[PDB]
Design an enzyme around this catalytic site. Structure first.
Site, PDB file in Angstrom:
ATOM      1  CG  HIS A  24      12.707 -15.666   9.864  1.00 56.97           C
ATOM      2  ND1 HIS A  24      12.362 -16.164   8.626  1.00 56.97           N
ATOM      3  CD2 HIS A  24      12.454 -14.337   9.819  1.00 56.97           C
ATOM      4  CE1 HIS A  24      11.921 -15.179   7.865  1.00 56.97           C
ATOM      5  NE2 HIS A  24      11.967 -14.059   8.564  1.00 56.97           N
TER       6      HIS A  24
ATOM      7  CB  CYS B 273       8.621 -21.207   7.953  1.00 56.37           C
ATOM      8  SG  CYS B 273      10.044 -20.419   8.744  1.00 56.37           S
TER       9      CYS B 273
END
EC number: 3.5.3.27
Lengths: 107, 656
Positions: B165, B261
Site C-alpha cells: 500500500h 490505515c
C-alpha cells in the site's frame, strides 16, 4: 516402513494436489530473510537449522550461537564434524592440524 | 473543519492471508488490546479533528482499516474495488455510508481494482494526487480517478510485497513535505518523486522506521500521529514544524496496518486551477508470433511489468489446427509518456501494432551535431527489422545491435549506422512507431560437437562464410594443430584475434613452448625484423601454426590491439576504429562464428554480428557460455573442443 497387508495407492487415479552475488544484493536478500524469520519467531513458529562444519570454518560459530541464544533456532541437524569443530574452537580458539581434533574427541 | 472517518474493532479478527503481514497470525489477536489501542488512537485524533464513526459488520473484521474504503475529494468518492475477495464484501457497507453522507459515489469496473486512500494520497497542498499501482491497484484505474475527481494523478510503482500500500511507505505532509521510504519504489517512480519534490522537503526513513510502519502516519496541520518513531526520525520531524505524538498500534500490525490505515480524511481540498489530466499512455498491440507454445506471451508480459507498465490481455484466439498459430491482442499502459517507448521497443522484437489504424510510418530527425544522434533515436537490435517509409516496408541493411537506423528518402532505404559515423543531415529513426521485425562443465560435449561438425561441413560445402575468433587459450590448451587443420581444410574463412594469440602460436611453432616471459619478446622482435607475419612465413622462420596456415592458404586475419600488448606485431592494428571496421568487413556474409576463448573479443564480435548467424561460444568459465537455439554454448576446455571437432569432421569428410 511398509507392513504386510497395507493398501498402497497405485497408478494415477483419484489423486489431486490442493497445493556469486555481490554483497549489495546479498544484503537485500538477507533483509528479506531476516524479516521472515522475525515474523515466524514472534508467533509460535518453528525454525530448524541444518549446519555443517563450514559454519565454523568461516567464523560463523559466534553468529549461529547468537541465533540459538536469541531463540531463532528450535532444532539443529548436523553431524560429527560440526560438533567437534565447534567444541575445538570453544576450547582452543582454533579449528582444523588433525591432531587437535582427536584430543577434543577423546576429551 | 477537518473530518476523519473511522471504524471500531467490534468484529475484528484475523482470518485472511491477504498480505505478507498476515501469514502466521490467523486468530492470533487479542481484541482487548486492539480495542484499547483503537480507543487511544481515536481520542488522540479527536483532539485534532472531527472523527466520524461507522458501525462495523459481523463477518468483515478488516473493515476497521477505513483508508481502504475509498478516496474522497470534495463530496466525490471513488468507491474501492478490492483485489482479493475477502474484503469485497465490505464494499457495500462503505458505499452505504458514502451515499448516506451525501457523496457522489463512483464505482470502478469490477475487473479494475483500486484500494482507496491506502493507494492514493493527495499532496497536502492539493496540487496533485500520488497514486500507487502494482499489488492491489491497477495502473489502468488511474485515468478514471483523474477523470472523475478532476485532479492530476501521478503514478508510483510499488516493488516490495511488505509495502503493498502506498500509505505504508508514502505520506505527504503539510508545508509541501514528503515523508517516504525510497526502497519501496522502482527507479522511475523515485525519479518522479524527486522531480516533483525538492530535496529540502523530502524526509527519507531508515529501514528500521519503515518496517514499523513509520510512514503510516496521520497528519493534522503540525501534529503527526504514528505508531512508533526513532529518536533520529522524531528529531528530523521536529526539525520541520511537525510535532510527533506516538501511540501503540501493534495489534493491528498483525494484519499489516497502522494509524493511517485506520483513518480516512473526508474533507479533501479542491483546487480549481488543476482541472483534470493524467500522464499515463495506453496502447493496444497484437502478437502473431506462433510461439503460443514455448511462452512468447510470458516474456512480453514480464517485460511490461518489470519495466513499470501494466497490461490486460484482451482477446485470445486459438487456431483450428497445429498449423494455425494462436495470436492475441494486448493493451499495454505506462505511467510515463515514453516508458511506453522502452516497453514498445522491447516488444517490437515479436509483434506489431494492430492493423486497422495503429500503423504509422516511422519518424526521423536530422543530424545537427557531427556523430551525435538526436535524443530518443531508435536503438537497433540484432534481429532483422523493417521500417515503414512512404507507406512501404523497407528492409534495414547491415542489421546490427546498438546502432542508429538512418533512412534515405528519395531512394527509400534504411541502414544501420554507428553513432560516430553519423554525418550531418542524416535522417535517423526516432521513437517506436512503424518498426517491425520478422523471424559445472558439460559432461557429454561430444553430442554438441557432433551437431556442430555436421553443420560446419554443410555450410562449407555450399560456399558459406565461417569466421573464427581466437585467443591465446587456444594455444595454451594444445589446440594449435587442430585449428591449423581446420584452416587447411577450408573451414576457416576469416580469423579475428589479437597480438597475444599470434605471438603464442608463433612461439609454440618455433620454440615448442608457449606462454619465462622472455620468449615473447624474442619472437616479437624476430617477427618485427621480418616486418610482418607474411614475410616471416615466406622467409621460413615460421614453418607451422595457425598464422602460418592463415598466410599460406590466403585466409584474411585481423589482430586487434590491446592495452596489454607487450609488443605489436607489424600486423596488430593499434587503431581500434580501423580494427572495428576490419572486423565488420571480415564478419560480413558469415554463416557461423566459432568463438574460441576470447571473452572480450566474443562480446564485441557478437555485438557486430546479426542474428541470422549461428554463434558457437566455447569456454570452461562457464558463465561466459551464457550468450543468448540460434546460438550454441559449450562448457569445456577449448583444446578438447577443437580435438573432438577435428575428429568428428574427419569421420564426416573422410569416407576414403
Amino acid at each position: 516402513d511398509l507392513q504386510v497387508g497395507d493398501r498402497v495407492m497405485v497408478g494415477v487415479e483419484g489423486i489431486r494436489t490442493i497445493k556469486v552475488s555481490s554483497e549489495r544484493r546479498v544484503e537485500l536478500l538477507v533483509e528479506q530473510i531476516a524479516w521472515e524469520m522475525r515474523q515466524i519467531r514472534d508467533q509460535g513458529g518453528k525454525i530448524v537449522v541444518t549446519a555443517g562444519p563450514v559454519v565454523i570454518h568461516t567464523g560463523g560459530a559466534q553468529h549461529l550461537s547468537h541465533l540459538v541464544r536469541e531463540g531463532y533456532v528450535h532444532a539443529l541437524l548436523g553431524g560429527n564434524a560440526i560438533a567437534v569443530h565447534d567444541i575445538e574452537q570453544a576450547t582452543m580458539g582454533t579449528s582444523l592440524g588433525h591432531r587437535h581434533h582427536l584430543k577434543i574427541i577423546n576429551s | 473543519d477537518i473530518r476523519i472517518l473511522m471504524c471500531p474493532p467490534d468484529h475484528y479478527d484475523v482470518d485472511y492471508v491477504i498480505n505478507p503481514w498476515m501469514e502466521g497470525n490467523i486468530h492470533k489477536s487479542s481484541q482487548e488490546r486492539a480495542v484499547e489501542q483503537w480507543k487511544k488512537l481515536h481520542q488522540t485524533i479527536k483532539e485534532c479533528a472531527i472523527v466520524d464513526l461507522v458501525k462495523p459488520a459481523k463477518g468483515w473484521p478488516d473493515m476497521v482499516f477505513t483508508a481502504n474504503a475509498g478516496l474522497v475529494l470534495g463530496e466525490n468518492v471513488v468507491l474501492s474495488r478490492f483485489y482479493h475477495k475477502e474484503r469485497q464484501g465490505e464494499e457495500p457497507y462503505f458505499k452505504a455510508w458514502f451515499e448516506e453522507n451525501g457523496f457522489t459515489v463512483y464505482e470502478l469496473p469490477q475487473d479494475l481494482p483500486f484500494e482507496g486512500a491506502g493507494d492514493a494520497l493527495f499532496d497536502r497542498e492539493g496540487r496533485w494526487l500520488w497514486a500507487g499501482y502494482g499489488f492491489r491497484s491497477e495502473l489502468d484505474s488511474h485515468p478514471y480517478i483523474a477523470k472523475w475527481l478532476d485532479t492530476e494523478v501521478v503514478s508510483l510503482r510499488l516493488i516490495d510485497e511488505r509495502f503493498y500500500h502506498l500509505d505504508t511507505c508514502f505520506c505527504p505532509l503539510s508545508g509541501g513535505y514528503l515523508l517516504y521510504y525510497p526502497p519501496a519504489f522502482d527507479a522511475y517512480s523515485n525519479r518522479v518523486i524527486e522531480m516533483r519534490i525538492p530535496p529540502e522537503k523530502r524526509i527519507i526513513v531508515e529501514e528500521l522506521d519503515a518496517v514499523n510502519f513509520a510512514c503510516n502516519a496521520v497528519n493534522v496541520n503540525d501534529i503527526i500521529i504514528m505508531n512508533l518513531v526513532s529518536r533520529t526520525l522524531k528529531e528530523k520531524l521536529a526539525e520541520a514544524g511537525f510535532k510527533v505524538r506516538e501511540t501503540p498500534l501493534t495489534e493491528f500490525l498483525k494484519a499489516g496496518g497502522a494509524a493511517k490505515c485506520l483513518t480516512l480524511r473526508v474533507t479533501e481540498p479542491i483546487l480549481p486551477d488543476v482541472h483534470a489530466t493524467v500522464s499515463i499512455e495506453s496502447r493496444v498491440i497484437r502478437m502473431e508470433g506462433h510461439l503460443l507454445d514455448a511462452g512468447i506471451l510470458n516474456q512480453a508480459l514480464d517485460l511490461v511489468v518489470e519495466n513499470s507498465g501494466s497490461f490486460r490481455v484482451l482477446n485470445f484466439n486459438l487456431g483450428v489446427e497445429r498449423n494455425s498459430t494462436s495470436s492475441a491482442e494486448v493493451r499495454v499502459s505506462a505511467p510515463s509518456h515514453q516508458i511506453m517507448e522502452e516497453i514498445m521497443t522491447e516488444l517490437i522484437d515479436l509483434g506489431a501494432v494492430p492493423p486497422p489504424q495503429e500503423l504509422c510510418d516511422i519518424n526521423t530527425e536530422t543530424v545537427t551535431q557531427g556523430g551525435v544522434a538526436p535524443d530518443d533515436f531508435y536503438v537497433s537490435t540484432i534481429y532483422p527489422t523493417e521500417v515503414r517509409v512512404n507507406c512501404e516496408w523497407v528492409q534495414v541493411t547491415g542489421q546490427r545491435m546498438d546502432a542508429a537506423i538512418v533512412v534515405t528518402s528519395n531512394p527509400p532505404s534504411a541502414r544501420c549506422v554507428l553513432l560516430r559515423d553519423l554525418q550531418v543531415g542524416d535522417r535517423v529513426m526516432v521513437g517506436v512507431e512503424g518498426i517491425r521485425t520478422i523471424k559445472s562443465s558439460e559432461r557429454r560435449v561430444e553430442l554438441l560437437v557432433e551437431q556442430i561438425a555436421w553443420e560446419m561441413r554443410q555450410i562449407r560445402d555450399q560456399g558459406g562464410k565461417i569466421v573464427v575468433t581466437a585467443g591465446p587459450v587456444v594455444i595454451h590448451t594444445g589446440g594449435a594443430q587442430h585449428l591449423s587443420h581446420l584452416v587447411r581444410e577450408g573451414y576457416v574463412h576469416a580469423l579475428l584475434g589479437g597480438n597475444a594469440i599470434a605471438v603464442h602460436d608463433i612461439e609454440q611453432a618455433t620454440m615448442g613452448t608457449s606462454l619465462g616471459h622472455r620468449h615473447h619478446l624474442k619472437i616479437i622482435n624476430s617477427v618485427r625484423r621480418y616486418g610482418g607475419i607474411r614475410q616471416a612465413v615466406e622467409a621460413g622462420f615460421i614453418s607451422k601454426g595457425v598464422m602460418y596456415e592463415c598466410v599460406k592458404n590466403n585466409i584474411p586475419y585481423c589482430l586487434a590491439g590491446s592495452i596489454r600488448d607487450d609488443g605489436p606485431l607489424p600486423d596488430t592494428e593499434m587503431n581500434l576504429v580501423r580494427a572495428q571496421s576490419r572486423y565488420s568487413e571480415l564478419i560480413q556474409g558469415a554463416d557461423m562464428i566459432l568463438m574460441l576463448s576470447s571473452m572480450l573479443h566474443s562480446i564485441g564480435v557478437g555485438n557486430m554480428t546479426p542474428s541470422g548467424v549461428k554463434m558457437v561460444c566455447v569456454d570452461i568459465n562457464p558463465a561466459v557460455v551464457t550468450k543468448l537455439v540460434e546460438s550454441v554454448g559449450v562448457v569445456t576446455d577449448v583444446g578438447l573442443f577443437l580435438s573432438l571437432l577435428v575428429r568428428q569432421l574427419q569421420q564426416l569428410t573422410r569416407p576414403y
